[PDB]
A paper describes a structure:
NAMPT functions as a homo-dimeric enzyme that catalyzes the rate limiting step in the primary salvage pathway for NAD synthesis, the transfer of a phosphoribosyl residue from 5-phosphoribosyl-1-pyrophosphate (PRPP) to nicotinamide (NAM) to produce nicotinamide mononucleotide (NMN). Crystal structures of NAMPT in numerous ligand-bound forms have been reported. These structures consistently display a NAMPT homo-dimer with two essentially identical active sites at the dimer interface. Typical NAMPT inhibitors were found to occupy the portion of active site responsible for NAM binding and a tunnel-shaped cavity extending from the NAM binding site. Furthermore, we determine the crystal structures of six NAMPT mutants in the apo form and in complex with various inhibitors and present a definitive model to explain the differential effects of the mutations on various structural classes of NAMPT inhibitors.
The crystal structures of G217 mutants revealed that they also perturbed inhibitor binding through a His191-mediated mechanism. Glycine is required for this position to allow a water molecule to bind and participate in the D219-H191-WAT-Y188 network. The addition of a Cβ atom in G217A occludes the water molecule and disrupts the hydrogen bond network. In addition, A217 pushes the H191 imidazole ring away from its normal orientation by 30°, rendering this part of the tunnel less compatible with GNE-618 binding. The conformational changes induced by G217A are amplified in the G217V mutant, where the H191 side chain is twisted 40° away from the optimal herringbone conformation. Similar to H191R, inhibitors with narrow and flexible linkers, including APO866, are less sensitive to the relatively subtle changes induced by the G217A and G217V mutations, which is also consistent with the modest drop in the biochemical potency of compounds 9-11. The RD line harboring the G217V mutation also had the D93 deletion. The D93del/G217V RD line is 500 to 4000 fold resistant suggesting that a significant increase in resistance is conferred by the G217V mutation.
Residue numbers in the entry:
A (entry chain A): 8 to 43, 53 to 487
B (entry chain B): 8 to 42, 53 to 486
Write the structure that this text describes.
Amino acid sequence: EFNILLATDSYKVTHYKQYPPNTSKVYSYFECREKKKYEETVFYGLQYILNKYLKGKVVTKEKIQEAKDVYKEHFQDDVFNEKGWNYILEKYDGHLPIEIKAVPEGFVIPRGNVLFTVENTDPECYWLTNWIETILVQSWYPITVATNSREQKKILAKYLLETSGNLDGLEYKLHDFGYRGVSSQETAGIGASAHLVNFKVTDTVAGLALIKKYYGTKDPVPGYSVPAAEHSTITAWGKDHEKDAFEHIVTQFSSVPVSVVSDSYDIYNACEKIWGEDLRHLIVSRSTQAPLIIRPDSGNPLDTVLKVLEILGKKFPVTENSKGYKLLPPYLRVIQGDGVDINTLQEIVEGMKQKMWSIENIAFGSGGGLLQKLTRDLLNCSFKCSYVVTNGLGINVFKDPVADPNKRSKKGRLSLHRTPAGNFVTLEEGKGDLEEYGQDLLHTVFKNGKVTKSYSFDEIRKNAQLNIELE
Amino acid sequence: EFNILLATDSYKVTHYKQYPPNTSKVYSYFECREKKYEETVFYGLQYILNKYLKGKVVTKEKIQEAKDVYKEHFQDDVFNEKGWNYILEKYDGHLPIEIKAVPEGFVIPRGNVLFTVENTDPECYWLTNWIETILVQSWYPITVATNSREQKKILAKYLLETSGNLDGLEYKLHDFGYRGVSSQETAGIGASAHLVNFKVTDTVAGLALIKKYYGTKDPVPGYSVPAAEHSTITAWGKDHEKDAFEHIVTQFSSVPVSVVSDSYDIYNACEKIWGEDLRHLIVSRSTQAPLIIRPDSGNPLDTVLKVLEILGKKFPVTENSKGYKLLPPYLRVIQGDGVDINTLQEIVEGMKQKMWSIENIAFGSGGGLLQKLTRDLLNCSFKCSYVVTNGLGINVFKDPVADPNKRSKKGRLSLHRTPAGNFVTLEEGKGDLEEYGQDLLHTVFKNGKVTKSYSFDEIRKNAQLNIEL
């Protein structure tokens, strides 16, 4: 079972001995710090953490003793605030005396703004605010996946609108293939859920149960997939029988969309000769609702996509849409699912546009690039103490390292507001109390062991919409 | 609760319909495919076998749950209810799968078979690749362990060169990655993989994982020491940095203590606060209880060099037997910002050039150690190499025209020692010719049971550097 007393960075066990004596309040905040592009971030994932790890009775006698035993050996010393944890157990039935205020999930906020704040609600527990830094800071991950996925959606939307005149199918154009490429089962669920803020296609099944349990949707599920081959289901037929494998697979799945990996031996031959000649009669008969989706999986992503489109354009009847771009017949599409990240996605759609191919023709699959190749440094996700009360006096505190102004932190009590022009501003030093800027956009989401405000996944998706979608 | 029917890539739900009719066996293998990182540490499969694959993993409820989810997820009924029910009814929900693997902690060159998977019941031909997704996540502990061991090789080389021995090597790279990984589960797995090579960590999650799944003779596999963070310094107020420092080192007067010193001005903190105002509190400390000064910003090499130059003018420096400068034993430094395998190399080389011993320094690494890694680093990959269809075995493989590096191995595989004592992987069942002695893989899972396992002490022994041996 999970033990909150063992879910912090080891050194934090020692901090209750290090704060100024007579400190009754420690107040801290999280931001995606501005860096002298990712100019705005999607706030998402805190609700998972609050419910799974922070709410209710999280302290017991047994958990205190377990932590005491471990820390004794881990430090080779007895440092451990047993009294402080016993107080929470006895006075609050093991519920954390902490208040967290947060911007609503799904909100899209420019860099350098307060996204949530944390403070103790009982003077005895001044040390607890930063105990839970480690677990709260892991919100960097769903924030960053959601943000990077949304930035890819912006690229897709721009190029889809330009080459086709509309955004039809946009939510189905970036498919999460990252289950095997992330570092754990838990990561898989969190990351997949964050991608579903922006799109509706995933093979990372773990995301669905997370959303159902912690957020919820009106629809039965938040994300969908379609039948698809992998190299094993092609290669198992033997080298000389790739055509037999293809025929078997498209016939088994004759009335739904089906994706077929086509580069086991020679992607160009498969497209031109197997699909384009031997099995053409099985492709041109398919429904618009059940296309064959050809899947290259190797070679230079841009070069390969363009050559695949060139081959198919010569074997199948291509039309020219009203924007002047070429379009494959509706029973035939392509998905590029190798080597896709935000940079290569951009290169591919631009290369397609230059060669006059509509983005209607293609979808992308991304795995490691979508869910694993991301770090806390990307958006400078960071949690810092900005205000303490010592001897009954509040003081505004901060760091400001001489050699790195980008690491300077905010001072005092913070609040988030709309500006007169409709943008966002973070007010420092308790200046939100002057009430010159309308209502604080942070809301209490957790107080004294209870989750006090929750969002559905539908609301989160609404908050995270692109401007181009709004228009 | 975890449900293995919902722990696969969605498309694999449809694969049982795509293999050749009358296929009775699908045999697959994992490697770190060949193209830096010429050898890999095999670590972490035992966690996966125990946490997710062993025992009764199928129930009627789990089957019904999966059926209901996939019906909506595919907008169609494609789920193999009958196949999963067969496992439930015939094997009381235990997986009819056999997995063979190299011993954990083994250090093996790229492009070798590391583990193999096959079904033990013909009805369950589809099961081998169902579990690809979950087994392939072994890339992560393998890659963490490998990259951590590569950093240890660098530290060993330079510590040996500048000090003449390896004392303290296992205390030289401290895991600071708890907040910088993607989840609680990842934190435990990754921290455990780092502890294959080192003994210092703040990622507490790793301790319980090791205790539960591997075990050590010692009470714990890893250690930490008291240390400040910016909040415990800045909370005192900007004009009271000295007071914070004095309080902290007095509270921790007889154990090592690390104190972040760059809240406002690292160079002032070192030269004036530590080097003058509080000097009397530092020079009085035990060798067993040094102050460890922690810079945390600026160019990592430039800041380390300048911090050392400052301290060398304020404290009595000696010259060790190798001719390198050494701070007094009550004073050390830890660089815990911007450290990854590349910058670690740059810092120790730069110290060596300025005649500073690597004894003086330790490193902390977080995102660089546990998060900034992907499955592409070592090309960790699971592929089918052998099937039986209509009673006939066939050697199968992919070999994409545009990327020879993605070619996979053919047929039944085995791992062997060569005459020169190296590793070779034999394909096409050739291990059976018995020209290369015994298969070095061991059966580790069979029919719902873990059949071979390793303690964390044995894994550490397997993972030792040549220089340590």
